[PDB]
Amino acid sequence: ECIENYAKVNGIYIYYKLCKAPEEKAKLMTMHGGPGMSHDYLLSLRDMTKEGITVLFYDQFGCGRSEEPDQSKFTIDYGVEEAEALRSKLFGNEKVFLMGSSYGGALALAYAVKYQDHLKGLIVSGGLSSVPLTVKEMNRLIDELPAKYRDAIKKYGSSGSYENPEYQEAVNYFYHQHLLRSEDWPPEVLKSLEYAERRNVYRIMNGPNEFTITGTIKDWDITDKISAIKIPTLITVGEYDQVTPNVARVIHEKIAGSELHVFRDCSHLTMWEDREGYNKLLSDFILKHL
Numbered sequence: 001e002c003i004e005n006y007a008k009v010n011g012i013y014i015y016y017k018l019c020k021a022p023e024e025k026a027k028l029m030t031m032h033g034g035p036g037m038s039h040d041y042l043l044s045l046r047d048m049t050k051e052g053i054t055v056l057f058y059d060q061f062g063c064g065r066s067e068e069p070d071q072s073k074f075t076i077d078y079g080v081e082e083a084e085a086l087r088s089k090l091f092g093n094e095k096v097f098l099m100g101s102s103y104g105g106a107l108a109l110a111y112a113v114k115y116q117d118h119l120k121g122l123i124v125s126g127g128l129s130s131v132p133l134t135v136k137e138m139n140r141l142i143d144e145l146p147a148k149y150r151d152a153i154k155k156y157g158s159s160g161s162y163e164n165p166e167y168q169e170a171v172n173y174f175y176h177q178h179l180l181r182s183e184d185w186p187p188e189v190l191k192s193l194e195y196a197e198r199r200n201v202y203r204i205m206n207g208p209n210e211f212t213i214t215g216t217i218k219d220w221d222i223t224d225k226i227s228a229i230k231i232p233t234l235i236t237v238g239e240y241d242q243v244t245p246n247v248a249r250v251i252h253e254k255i256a257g258s259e260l261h262v263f264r265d266c267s268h269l270t271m272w273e274d275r276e277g278y279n280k281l282l283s284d285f286i287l288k289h290l
Protein backbone atom coordinates (compact mmCIF):
# COMPACT_ATOMS: atom_id res chain seq x y z
CA GLU A 1 0.00 0.00 0.00
CA CYS A 2 0.84 3.71 -0.10
CA ILE A 3 2.75 5.34 2.72
CA GLU A 4 0.63 7.84 4.61
CA ASN A 5 1.66 10.65 6.94
CA TYR A 6 0.63 13.91 8.58
CA ALA A 7 3.76 16.06 8.37
CA LYS A 8 4.52 19.75 8.88
CA VAL A 9 4.97 21.55 5.57
CA ASN A 10 5.90 25.21 5.30
CA GLY A 11 4.21 25.88 8.63
CA ILE A 12 1.00 23.87 8.98
CA TYR A 13 0.39 20.11 8.98
CA ILE A 14 -0.37 18.53 5.61
CA TYR A 15 -1.50 14.96 4.97
CA TYR A 16 -0.04 13.12 2.00
CA LYS A 17 -0.24 9.71 0.37
CA LEU A 18 2.88 8.48 -1.40
CA CYS A 19 2.31 5.31 -3.44
CA LYS A 20 5.83 4.29 -4.42
CA ALA A 21 6.03 2.55 -7.80
CA PRO A 22 7.65 -0.94 -7.81
CA GLU A 23 10.24 -0.15 -10.44
CA GLU A 24 9.53 3.60 -10.68
CA LYS A 25 10.88 5.56 -13.60
CA ALA A 26 9.36 8.81 -12.41
CA LYS A 27 7.55 10.52 -9.53
CA LEU A 28 4.27 12.37 -10.14
CA MET A 29 2.93 15.03 -7.83
CA THR A 30 -0.81 15.76 -7.83
CA MET A 31 -3.00 18.76 -6.98
CA HIS A 32 -6.72 18.21 -6.39
CA GLY A 33 -9.23 20.85 -7.42
CA GLY A 34 -11.83 22.88 -5.57
CA PRO A 35 -10.24 24.77 -4.09
CA GLY A 36 -11.08 22.97 -0.85
CA MET A 37 -11.57 19.29 -1.71
CA SER A 38 -9.11 16.39 -1.31
CA HIS A 39 -6.78 13.95 -3.06
CA ASP A 40 -9.46 11.29 -2.64
CA TYR A 41 -10.97 11.79 -6.07
CA LEU A 42 -7.60 11.47 -7.76
CA LEU A 43 -6.89 7.96 -6.43
CA SER A 44 -7.67 6.46 -9.83
CA LEU A 45 -4.26 7.75 -10.98
CA ARG A 46 -2.77 5.22 -8.58
CA ASP A 47 -2.97 2.67 -11.39
CA MET A 48 0.01 4.45 -12.88
CA THR A 49 2.22 2.85 -10.27
CA LYS A 50 1.85 -0.28 -12.44
CA GLU A 51 3.65 1.72 -15.15
CA GLY A 52 6.54 2.49 -12.79
CA ILE A 53 5.15 5.86 -11.79
CA THR A 54 5.14 6.92 -8.15
CA VAL A 55 2.12 9.10 -7.38
CA LEU A 56 2.16 11.67 -4.59
CA PHE A 57 -1.32 12.46 -3.27
CA TYR A 58 -1.91 15.20 -0.70
CA ASP A 59 -4.59 17.47 0.78
CA GLN A 60 -3.75 21.13 0.31
CA PHE A 61 -3.91 23.67 3.16
CA GLY A 62 -7.26 23.54 4.97
CA CYS A 63 -8.33 20.62 2.77
CA GLY A 64 -9.28 17.04 3.50
CA ARG A 65 -7.22 15.81 6.43
CA SER A 66 -4.74 18.71 6.40
CA GLU A 67 -4.48 21.59 8.84
CA GLU A 68 -6.13 24.90 8.01
CA PRO A 69 -3.80 27.97 7.86
CA ASP A 70 -4.51 31.60 8.63
CA GLN A 71 -7.42 32.71 6.41
CA SER A 72 -5.07 35.40 5.10
CA LYS A 73 -3.01 32.61 3.58
CA PHE A 74 -5.98 31.24 1.65
CA THR A 75 -4.28 32.24 -1.59
CA ILE A 76 -3.09 30.37 -4.65
CA ASP A 77 0.45 31.68 -4.26
CA TYR A 78 0.37 30.04 -0.85
CA GLY A 79 -0.59 26.71 -2.31
CA VAL A 80 2.39 27.01 -4.64
CA GLU A 81 4.77 27.53 -1.73
CA GLU A 82 3.16 24.70 0.17
CA ALA A 83 3.54 22.47 -2.91
CA GLU A 84 7.22 23.32 -3.38
CA ALA A 85 7.82 22.89 0.34
CA LEU A 86 6.28 19.43 0.20
CA ARG A 87 8.16 18.47 -2.99
CA SER A 88 11.44 19.44 -1.41
CA LYS A 89 10.55 17.93 1.94
CA LEU A 90 9.93 14.61 0.22
CA PHE A 91 12.18 14.67 -2.84
CA GLY A 92 14.66 17.39 -1.99
CA ASN A 93 15.88 18.55 -5.39
CA GLU A 94 14.59 15.85 -7.73
CA LYS A 95 12.63 17.05 -10.78
CA VAL A 96 9.14 15.56 -10.97
CA PHE A 97 5.96 15.66 -13.04
CA LEU A 98 3.19 17.92 -11.73
CA MET A 99 -0.48 17.12 -12.37
CA GLY A 100 -3.35 19.33 -11.38
CA SER A 101 -7.08 18.88 -11.79
CA SER A 102 -9.47 21.76 -12.18
CA TYR A 103 -8.41 24.25 -9.53
CA GLY A 104 -5.52 21.91 -9.00
CA GLY A 105 -4.56 22.46 -12.62
CA ALA A 106 -4.70 26.23 -12.32
CA LEU A 107 -2.65 25.83 -9.10
CA ALA A 108 -0.15 23.70 -11.00
CA LEU A 109 0.29 26.37 -13.69
CA ALA A 110 0.97 28.99 -11.02
CA TYR A 111 3.55 26.62 -9.57
CA ALA A 112 5.21 25.94 -12.92
CA VAL A 113 5.44 29.64 -13.63
CA LYS A 114 7.66 29.91 -10.57
CA TYR A 115 9.24 26.48 -10.03
CA GLN A 116 9.08 24.84 -13.45
CA ASP A 117 12.69 23.93 -12.80
CA HIS A 118 11.72 21.21 -10.33
CA LEU A 119 9.43 19.91 -13.04
CA LYS A 120 10.20 17.27 -15.68
CA GLY A 121 6.69 17.73 -17.04
CA LEU A 122 3.30 19.29 -16.34
CA ILE A 123 -0.25 17.92 -16.64
CA VAL A 124 -3.35 20.09 -16.45
CA SER A 125 -6.69 18.33 -16.52
CA GLY A 126 -9.85 20.38 -16.53
CA GLY A 127 -7.50 23.17 -15.46
CA LEU A 128 -7.79 26.90 -16.19
CA SER A 129 -5.62 30.02 -16.52
CA SER A 130 -8.43 32.47 -15.77
CA VAL A 131 -11.42 32.12 -13.55
CA PRO A 132 -13.37 34.89 -15.32
CA LEU A 133 -12.94 32.99 -18.56
CA THR A 134 -14.00 29.66 -17.04
CA VAL A 135 -16.94 31.44 -15.46
CA LYS A 136 -17.86 32.99 -18.81
CA GLU A 137 -17.74 29.51 -20.30
CA MET A 138 -19.73 28.00 -17.42
CA ASN A 139 -22.54 30.49 -17.93
CA ARG A 140 -22.85 29.39 -21.54
CA LEU A 141 -23.15 25.85 -20.27
CA ILE A 142 -25.84 26.83 -17.78
CA ASP A 143 -27.90 28.56 -20.44
CA GLU A 144 -27.42 25.54 -22.71
CA LEU A 145 -29.11 23.23 -20.20
CA PRO A 146 -32.86 22.67 -20.51
CA ALA A 147 -34.91 25.71 -19.47
CA LYS A 148 -36.28 23.80 -16.48
CA TYR A 149 -32.90 23.60 -14.71
CA ARG A 150 -31.33 26.64 -16.37
CA ASP A 151 -33.88 29.10 -14.99
CA ALA A 152 -33.79 27.26 -11.65
CA ILE A 153 -30.11 28.15 -11.37
CA LYS A 154 -30.86 31.78 -12.22
CA LYS A 155 -33.76 32.05 -9.77
CA TYR A 156 -32.56 30.59 -6.46
CA GLY A 157 -29.01 31.46 -7.40
CA SER A 158 -29.86 35.16 -7.09
CA SER A 159 -31.87 34.61 -3.90
CA GLY A 160 -28.85 32.84 -2.41
CA SER A 161 -31.18 29.90 -1.84
CA TYR A 162 -28.91 26.98 -2.67
CA GLU A 163 -30.64 24.82 -0.07
CA ASN A 164 -33.83 24.79 -2.16
CA PRO A 165 -34.56 21.33 -3.70
CA GLU A 166 -35.69 22.72 -7.06
CA TYR A 167 -32.23 24.32 -7.17
CA GLN A 168 -30.39 21.24 -5.88
CA GLU A 169 -32.13 19.37 -8.70
CA ALA A 170 -30.60 21.59 -11.39
CA VAL A 171 -27.20 21.56 -9.67
CA ASN A 172 -27.11 17.79 -9.54
CA TYR A 173 -28.39 17.57 -13.13
CA PHE A 174 -25.56 19.79 -14.27
CA TYR A 175 -23.14 17.69 -12.25
CA HIS A 176 -24.16 14.42 -13.90
CA GLN A 177 -23.72 16.25 -17.16
CA HIS A 178 -20.44 18.20 -17.04
CA LEU A 179 -18.91 16.95 -13.76
CA LEU A 180 -19.25 13.14 -14.05
CA ARG A 181 -21.27 11.94 -17.08
CA SER A 182 -23.78 9.10 -16.91
CA GLU A 183 -22.03 7.42 -14.00
CA ASP A 184 -22.81 6.08 -10.53
CA TRP A 185 -20.18 8.23 -8.78
CA PRO A 186 -17.48 6.30 -6.88
CA PRO A 187 -16.84 6.79 -3.16
CA GLU A 188 -13.56 8.65 -3.63
CA VAL A 189 -15.33 11.37 -5.58
CA LEU A 190 -18.14 11.54 -3.01
CA LYS A 191 -15.39 11.63 -0.44
CA SER A 192 -13.79 14.78 -1.84
CA LEU A 193 -17.17 16.46 -2.14
CA GLU A 194 -18.00 15.57 1.43
CA TYR A 195 -14.74 17.22 2.49
CA ALA A 196 -15.25 20.47 0.59
CA GLU A 197 -18.72 20.90 2.09
CA ARG A 198 -17.12 20.26 5.50
CA ARG A 199 -14.08 22.55 5.34
CA ASN A 200 -13.97 26.33 4.84
CA VAL A 201 -11.52 26.62 1.97
CA TYR A 202 -14.12 25.91 -0.70
CA ARG A 203 -16.66 28.25 0.88
CA ILE A 204 -14.20 31.14 1.07
CA MET A 205 -12.07 30.74 -2.05
CA ASN A 206 -14.60 29.22 -4.43
CA GLY A 207 -18.04 30.05 -3.08
CA PRO A 208 -21.45 28.25 -3.18
CA ASN A 209 -20.95 25.59 -5.85
CA GLU A 210 -19.11 24.89 -9.13
CA PHE A 211 -20.78 27.27 -11.55
CA THR A 212 -21.27 29.74 -8.69
CA ILE A 213 -17.71 31.06 -8.34
CA THR A 214 -17.93 34.14 -6.12
CA GLY A 215 -15.10 33.27 -3.76
CA THR A 216 -11.81 35.12 -3.41
CA ILE A 217 -10.40 33.58 -6.57
CA LYS A 218 -13.32 35.05 -8.61
CA ASP A 219 -11.01 37.31 -10.58
CA TRP A 220 -7.77 35.32 -10.61
CA ASP A 221 -6.14 35.30 -14.05
CA ILE A 222 -2.55 34.55 -15.06
CA THR A 223 -2.97 33.84 -18.77
CA ASP A 224 -0.48 36.63 -19.48
CA LYS A 225 2.19 34.70 -17.60
CA ILE A 226 1.70 31.01 -18.35
CA SER A 227 3.50 31.47 -21.67
CA ALA A 228 6.72 31.52 -19.66
CA ILE A 229 6.27 27.77 -19.22
CA LYS A 230 8.57 25.67 -21.40
CA ILE A 231 8.57 22.19 -19.88
CA PRO A 232 6.59 19.32 -21.47
CA THR A 233 2.92 19.90 -20.75
CA LEU A 234 -0.12 17.71 -21.34
CA ILE A 235 -3.47 19.55 -21.21
CA THR A 236 -6.52 17.26 -21.00
CA VAL A 237 -10.23 18.10 -20.84
CA GLY A 238 -13.49 16.28 -21.34
CA GLU A 239 -15.81 16.85 -24.26
CA TYR A 240 -18.59 17.89 -21.90
CA ASP A 241 -16.13 19.13 -19.27
CA GLN A 242 -17.58 21.88 -17.01
CA VAL A 243 -14.31 23.76 -17.56
CA THR A 244 -14.90 23.66 -21.34
CA PRO A 245 -12.13 22.71 -23.77
CA ASN A 246 -12.31 26.29 -24.96
CA VAL A 247 -10.75 27.19 -21.60
CA ALA A 248 -8.14 24.47 -22.00
CA ARG A 249 -7.38 26.00 -25.40
CA VAL A 250 -6.28 29.31 -23.88
CA ILE A 251 -3.67 27.35 -21.94
CA HIS A 252 -2.57 25.21 -24.88
CA GLU A 253 -2.27 28.25 -27.10
CA LYS A 254 0.11 29.92 -24.59
CA ILE A 255 2.31 26.98 -23.58
CA ALA A 256 4.43 26.00 -26.59
CA GLY A 257 5.15 22.35 -27.24
CA SER A 258 2.12 21.47 -25.19
CA GLU A 259 -0.27 18.71 -26.12
CA LEU A 260 -4.08 19.00 -25.88
CA HIS A 261 -6.29 15.93 -25.49
CA VAL A 262 -10.05 16.21 -25.43
CA PHE A 263 -11.78 13.19 -23.91
CA ARG A 264 -14.86 12.50 -26.00
CA ASP A 265 -17.96 11.46 -24.06
CA CYS A 266 -16.19 12.56 -20.87
CA SER A 267 -16.78 15.51 -18.60
CA HIS A 268 -14.67 17.04 -15.81
CA LEU A 269 -13.54 13.99 -13.85
CA THR A 270 -12.23 12.17 -16.89
CA MET A 271 -9.86 10.20 -14.63
CA TRP A 272 -12.93 8.20 -13.65
CA GLU A 273 -15.11 8.32 -16.76
CA ASP A 274 -12.17 6.74 -18.61
CA ARG A 275 -9.80 5.53 -15.91
CA GLU A 276 -7.76 3.20 -18.18
CA GLY A 277 -7.69 5.62 -21.07
CA TYR A 278 -6.87 8.57 -18.86
CA ASN A 279 -4.20 6.76 -16.90
CA LYS A 280 -2.58 5.47 -20.08
CA LEU A 281 -2.34 8.91 -21.64
CA LEU A 282 -0.61 10.45 -18.64
CA SER A 283 1.74 7.52 -18.18
CA ASP A 284 2.64 7.55 -21.87
CA PHE A 285 3.27 11.30 -21.67
CA ILE A 286 5.29 11.00 -18.44
CA LEU A 287 7.50 8.12 -19.62
CA LYS A 288 7.75 9.88 -23.00
CA HIS A 289 9.37 12.93 -21.40
CA LEU A 290 11.36 10.89 -18.91
Ligand SMILES: CC(C)C[C@H](N)C(=O)O
Residues within 6 Å of the ligand: 032, 033, 034, 035, 037, 101, 102, 103, 104, 206, 210, 213, 243, 268
Ligand atom coordinates in the same frame (compact mmCIF):
# COMPACT_ATOMS: atom_id res chain seq x y z
C1 LIG B 1 -12.80 26.40 -9.94
C2 LIG B 1 -13.74 25.25 -9.95
C3 LIG B 1 -14.37 25.08 -11.33
C4 LIG B 1 -13.00 23.97 -9.55
C5 LIG B 1 -13.89 22.81 -9.11
N1 LIG B 1 -14.31 22.99 -7.70
C6 LIG B 1 -13.18 21.47 -9.31
O1 LIG B 1 -12.25 21.20 -8.54
O2 LIG B 1 -13.56 20.70 -10.21
